[PDB]
Write a protein that binds this ligand. Structure first.
Ligand SMILES: CC(C)C[C@H](N)C(=O)O
Ligand code: NA
Ligand code: NA
Length: 502
C-alpha cells in the first residue's frame, strides 16, 4: 500500500485537503449572514467541541483501516463494527465525497475560467451608481454559467466554461493518477505555499482599501465584534457547525482516506492538530480578511451583509471583482483572487475524489490508473446535471455537503467511540502520537459531542428542513441512484472477497 513520503508532505496534503473554497467563499458569507462576531463565538466553540475531536477520530480510523489495507468507510466501519449495516452506512463515506465532488469540481472550473479571463484582460469595464459597478460583473457571471433567463429552470453554460471544466477535470486527473506521494504530496508542497503567499498579498492590498463608505478596518470590526444576543438562535449554531464540518472536510470520508496512507506508527495527533490549526488560520485570518473587509469598505456594513445574504457567488464572483475593477491593476488583482481560489479548489477536489479512487483500488482491486479514470468519468458525467439544471448544485450541496456531513460525523463518532468502544478508540487515537490528546477530550468525544450533534440534527430536521421547485426531485432521484450504485459496488466487493477467500 502507498504511504505519504514525508511528514511535511503529509501535513500540506491534509491542510491542502481542508483549506479551499470553504475558506474564501463559504465562510465569508456564513459569518456575514449570521452577524459577524455573533457567528464567530459558536463557530469557535464548534471548532473546539466538534472539529478537533472529529479530526482526530477521522485520522485514527483512516490510519487504522489503512494498516489493514482499507482506506474507505464501507470497509473501515465494518472492521470497527462487524455488521452488514456497518457497510451500508459506510457507503455514505463514498456517496458524500462523490456527490460533493460533482459540483465542487465545477465551481473550481469556474474559478479557473475567471482566472484566465482576468489574466488575458477580458473583463467587464464598469463605466457612480453602486449597482452599475456590479451589474456588468453579474452579467459576466450569468453569461459564464448561463443563468436561466426563461421560465424554465435551465442553465446554458458557455462553450469556454465547459472547455475549462474539461481542462480542470484533466488537471485533477493528472494529479491523482500519479498516486499519493508523487501525485498529491508533491503538488500540495507547491500549491500550499503559493496559496499562502497569494492570500497574504491579497489581505494586505485589501487592508489598503478605503472609500467614502468605510475601510477594511470596518469590515474587520464587524466580523470580530461579538454579539451575545444571537447565540440563543439555533440557526447560528447550525450554520457554525455546518461550516466547521465543511471547512475541516469532516464527514466527507476524505480525511479518513488520506489518513489511511499514514504509516501505522506515525503520529496522527500533532499532525491532525496541525492540519486543523492551519485550516483555521486560513479560515478566520485570511479568508475572513478579504471579501468581507473589501465589501464593507466599498458599500458599507449594511450593503455588505445584504450582498452576502444574497449569495456566496455574489461576494466571490461578482462583488469582489467589481470592487477590484475600481482600483489600479484591479484586473490583475482579480486574476490573483481567482488563481488563489483555483488552487485551493484543486487541492480540495483531488482530496474528495481520492476516496472513490481508494475504494476502487482497495476493495475492487482496480489499478490506480483505471480507478482514477473511472472516478473521473463518473464525476464528469454526473456534473452535467449540475451544469444544465438550476438548483441541482444547491440540492447536492445541502444534502451531501451540509446535512450528510453532520449526520456522517455523528455516525462515525458513534461507531468508533461507542460500538467499537471508547477505550479502544482512545488508545487507537493516541498510539504513536508525538503528543497525547488532553484527557478532557476523551469525555468531549464520548459524551458532549454526540449529544451536541444529536440535538443539533433533531432541531435541524424539525424546524429547518421544512424551510421547492419540482426539478429538485430530478436531482434527488439521481443522487439516490448514485447511492444504490455505490451500494451495488460494495456488494460486488464483498462478493469478490469471498471468492478470494475460498
Ligand atoms: C468538502 C471539502 C472538500 C471542502 C474543503 N475542506 C474546503 O473548505 O474548501
Ligand atoms: Na477549509
Ligand atoms: Na484545498
Amino acid at each position: 500500500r502507498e504511504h505519504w513520503a514525508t511528514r511535511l508532505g503529509l501535513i500540506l496534503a491534509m491542510a491542502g485537503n481542508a483549506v479551499g473554497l470553504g475558506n474564501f467563499l463559504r465562510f465569508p458569507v456564513q459569518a456575514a449572514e449570521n452577524g459577524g462576531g455573533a457567528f464567530m463565538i459558536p463557530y469557535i466553540i464548534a471548532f473546539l467541541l466538534v472539529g478537533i475531536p472529529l479530526m482526530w477520530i477521522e485520522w485514527a480510523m483512516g490510519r487504522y483501516g489503512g494498516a489493514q489495507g482499507h482506506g474507505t468507510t464501507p470497509a473501515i466501519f465494518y472492521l470497527l463494527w462487524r455488521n452488514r449495516f456497518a457497510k451500508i452506512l459506510g457507503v455514505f463515506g463514498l456517496w458524500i465525497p462523490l456527490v460533493v465532488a460533482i459540483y465542487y469540481v465545477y465551481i473550481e472550473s469556474w474559478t479557473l475560467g475567471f482566472a484566465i479571463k482576468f489574466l488575458v484582460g477580458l473583463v467587464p469595464e464598469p463605466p457612480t451608481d453602486p449597482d452599475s459597478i456590479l451589474r456588468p460583473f453579474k452579467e459576466f457571471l450569468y453569461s459564464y454559467i448561463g443563468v436561466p433567463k426563461g421560465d424554465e429552470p435551465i442553465l446554458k453554460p458557455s462553450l469556454f466554461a465547459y472547455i475549462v471544466f474539461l481542462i480542470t477535470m484533466f488537471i485533477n486527473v493528472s494529479i491523482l493518477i500519479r498516486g499519493i506521494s508523487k501525485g498529491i504530496e508533491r503538488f500540495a508542497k507547491i500549491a500550499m505555499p503559493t496559496l499562502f503567499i497569494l492570500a497574504v498579498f491579497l489581505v494586505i492590498r485589501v487592508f489598503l482599501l478605503e472609500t467614502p463608505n468605510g475601510t477594511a478596518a470596518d469590515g474587520l470590526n464587524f466580523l470580530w465584534t461579538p454579539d451575545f444576543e444571537k447565540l440563543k438562535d439555533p440557526g447560528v449554531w447550525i450554520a457554525a457547525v455546518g461550516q466547521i464540518f465543511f471547512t475541516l472536510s469532516l464527514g466527507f470520508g476524505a480525511i479518513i482516506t488520506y489518513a489511511s496512507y499514514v504509516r501505522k506508527d506515525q503520529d496522527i495527533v500533532l499532525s491532525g492538530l496541525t492540519a486543523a490549526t492551519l485550516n483555521e488560520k486560513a479560515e478566520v485570518i485570511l479568508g475572513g480578511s478579504i471579501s468581507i473587509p473589501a465589501a464593507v469598505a466599498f458599500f458599507g456594513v449594511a450593503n455588505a451583509v445584504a450582498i452576502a445574504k444574497a449569495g456566496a457567488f455574489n461576494l466571490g464572483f461578482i462583488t469582489l471583482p467589481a470592487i477590484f475593477s475600481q482600483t489600479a491593476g484591479g484586473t490583475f488583482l482579480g486574476f490573483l483572487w481567482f488563481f488563489l481560489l483555483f488552487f485551493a479548489g484543486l487541492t480540495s477536489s483531488i482530496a474528495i475524489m481520492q476516496p472513490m479512487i481508494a475504494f476502487l483500488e482497495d476493495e475492487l482491486k482496480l489499478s490506480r490508473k483505471h480507478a482514477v479514470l473511472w472516478t473521473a468519468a463518473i464525476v464528469f458525467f454526473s456534473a452535467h446535471l449540475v451544469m444544465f439544471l438550476n438548483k441541482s448544485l444547491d440540492e447536492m450541496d445541502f444534502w451531501a455537503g451540509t446535512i450528510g456531513v453532520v449526520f456522517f460525523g455523528l455516525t462515525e463518532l458513534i461507531i468508533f467511540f461507542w460500538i467499537f468502544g471508547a477505550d479502544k478508540a482512545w488508545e487507537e487515537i493516541n498510539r504513536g502520537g508525538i503528543i497525547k490528546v488532553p484527557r478532557i477530550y476523551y469525555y468531549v468525544m464520548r459524551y458532549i459531542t454526540p449529544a451536541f450533534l444529536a440535538v443539533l440534527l433533531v432541531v435541524w430536521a424539525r424546524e429547518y428542513i421544512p424551510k421547492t421547485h419540482w426539478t429538485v426531485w430530478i436531482t434527488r432521484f439521481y443522487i439516490i441512484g448514485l447511492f444504490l450504485f455505490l451500494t451495488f459496488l460494495v456488494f460486488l466487493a464483498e462478493r469478490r472477497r469471498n471468492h478470494e477467500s475460498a
